[PDB]
Amino acid sequence: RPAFCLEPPYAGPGAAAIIRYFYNAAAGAAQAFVYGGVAAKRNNFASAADALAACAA
């Protein structure tokens, strides 16, 4: 499991309200979060499937 998969979700400073997904390793689940549209970190994916593929192979 790449180490980035343990990062808390990061909305960043932006004012957009975009739905993205992060891997929540404690929950063993990909979960939706709000992304502000700038300053993404790595635990940020377009879909739950993409998050699971990277982080729960």
Numbering used by the authors: 1 to 57
Question: What does the publication say?
Answer:
Here, we report a structural and thermodynamic analysis of six extensively simplified BPTI variants, where 19–24 of its 58 residues are alanines, using differential scanning calorimetry (DSC) and X-ray crystallography. We used a stabilized BPTI- (BPTI- A14GA38V12), containing only the 5–55 disulfide bond, as the reference molecule instead of wild-type BPTI, which contains three disulfide bonds13, and a BPTI variant containing 19 alanines (BPTI-19A) as the template for further simplification. However, the alanine substitutions exerted a small unexpected enthalpy stabilization, and the magnitude of which increased in a nearly additive fashion along with the number of alanine substitutions, which was, however, over-compensated with entropy destabilization. A structural analysis indicated that new water molecules were recruited into the spaces created by the alanine substitutions, facilitating protein–water hydrogen-bonded interactions as well as interactions with the methyl group and creating hydration networks around the substitution sites.
